[PDB]
Amino acid sequence: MTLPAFKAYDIRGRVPDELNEDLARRIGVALAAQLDQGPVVLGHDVRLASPALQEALSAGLRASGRDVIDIGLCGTEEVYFQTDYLKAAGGVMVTASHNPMDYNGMKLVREQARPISSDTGLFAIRDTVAADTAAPGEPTASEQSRTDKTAYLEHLLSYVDRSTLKPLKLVVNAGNGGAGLIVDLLAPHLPFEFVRVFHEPDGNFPNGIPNPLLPENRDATAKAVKDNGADFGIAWDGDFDRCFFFDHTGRFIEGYYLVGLLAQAILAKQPGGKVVHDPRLTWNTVEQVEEAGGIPVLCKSGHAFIKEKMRSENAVYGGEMSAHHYFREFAYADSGMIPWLLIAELVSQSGRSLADLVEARMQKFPCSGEINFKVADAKASVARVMEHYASLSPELDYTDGISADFGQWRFNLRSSNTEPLLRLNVETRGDAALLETRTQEISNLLRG
Numbered sequence: 001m002t003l004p005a006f007k008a009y010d011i012r013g014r015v016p017d018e019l020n021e022d023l024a025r026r027i028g029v030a031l032a033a034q035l036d037q038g039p040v041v042l043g044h045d046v047r048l049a050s051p052a053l054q055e056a057l058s059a060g061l062r063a064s065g066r067d068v069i070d071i072g073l074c075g076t077e078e079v080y081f082q083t084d085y086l087k088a089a090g091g092v093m094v095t096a097s098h099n100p101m102d103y104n105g106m107k108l109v110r111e112q113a114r115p116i117s118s119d120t121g122l123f124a125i126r127d128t129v130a131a132d133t134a135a136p137g138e139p140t141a142s143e144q145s146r147t148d149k150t151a152y153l154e155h156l157l158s159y160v161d162r163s164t165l166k167p168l169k170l171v172v173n174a175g176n177g178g179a180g181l182i183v184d185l186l187a188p189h190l191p192f193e194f195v196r197v198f199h200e201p202d203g204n205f206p207n208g209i210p211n212p213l214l215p216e217n218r219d220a221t222a223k224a225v226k227d228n229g230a231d232f233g234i235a236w237d238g239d240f241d242r243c244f245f246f247d248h249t250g251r252f253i254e255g256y257y258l259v260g261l262l263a264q265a266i267l268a269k270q271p272g273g274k275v276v277h278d279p280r281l282t283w284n285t286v287e288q289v290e291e292a293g294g295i296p297v298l299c300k301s302g303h304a305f306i307k308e309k310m311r312s313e314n315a316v317y318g319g320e321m322s323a324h325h326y327f328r329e330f331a332y333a334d335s336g337m338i339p340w341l342l343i344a345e346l347v348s349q350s351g352r353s354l355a356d357l358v359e360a361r362m363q364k365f366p367c368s369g370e371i372n373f374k375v376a377d378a379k380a381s382v383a384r385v386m387e388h389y390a391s392l393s394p395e396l397d398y399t400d401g402i403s404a405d406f407g408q409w410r411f412n413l414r415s416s417n418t419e420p421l422l423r424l425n426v427e428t429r430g431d432a433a434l435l436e437t438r439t440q441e442i443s444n445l446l447r448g
């Protein structure tokens, strides 16, 4: 067979049977043969096994003659940023993002932090690793420790006009992942008062694995916002490339609406720019981008597609409803830090609450939220849905699964590229009743 840890976008598996130090070392060797000339940036998250997996990666890379730049404990976006900033040949982040504490993994990038995915080198690396029975060589290159975050922090701060910021009270919830370390390094440069929840890095995850989508984890941020009268709250996943917002009432804001909000915030600074968006939920983003003078660009979901579309279009910003936000000036990479800095600036400058910034958009384009289905026959289930609606003659688009536009409502229905699931998103033109009846109708057809 094949090694199960090699997924479409990254490496992730259980330690030590799906991923271990030996595999990690062999991955470093294979990665060296895939990259153009230069050093390789390595970083890791708070998980207990991550240092040892990074060390093994470094040993394989240096046995293959690659200099290693160890940036230490960090977020995934710091590996992206330093890989580009230091003009490295590539980078690896050791992380399992949101998986249990017995899982780990790797996200791999080449020059300018361009993704290495299944069809762009990752399965090539897998096959190499699978057949590699060579003895480990010894290092022929050095490792340098470069933990300085100054350039990264200054880059984050460059997205906001410091003099326009107000001393907002912000709940921050690192979920015992790594985000709190960056918050604390930014704080001396910001006027905000921070309310720190689950702040200390702890790979034992005593308060739950870092997944702000779990309602029990969500409620910790919501409660801290309400109990402290905070202007809003921010939570992150463990490697903090995903950020999650809570308004002053404690309400979790559906990530869809952050894409349009951030696009308007960016286009205020970068007039007329292109904005890349996914096909899952679209109408609000298209309208807000256009009303801010930008040009919306439909793109297949998935960071590798989004980033390459942004590059080919010189797009200033891209966003997915799945809490990923990409910035051209950030090496076209996603950041879980830039979004809340931009939102805090927008709240400061506009005098409006986060709630009111999104309220009218949520009323105008209500959405189902993403609903996942594990069914016995995904292909037959999709066919049942499409057959049922055929007589209404929807406008159909196959950018990413099936998108069907009926006029006053639309849906996207696609297979996930990270799990064996179907994912449904529905939205309507200001009609909550139609949203619920169509969502339930599609759901029944899928389960039939």
Ligand SMILES: O=P(O)(O)OC[C@H]1O[C@H](O)[C@H](O)[C@@H](O)[C@@H]1O
Binding pocket: 009, 301, 302, 303, 304, 320, 322, 324, 415, 416, 417, 418, 419, 423
């Ligand atoms: O909906 P999926 O195919 O499962 O992908 C969900 C997400 O997986 C990863 O997080 C990718 O980096 C994202 O770009 C993608 O949106």
Ligand SMILES: [Mg+2]
Binding pocket: 076, 097, 098, 237, 238, 239, 240, 241, 242
């Ligand atoms: Mg993550």
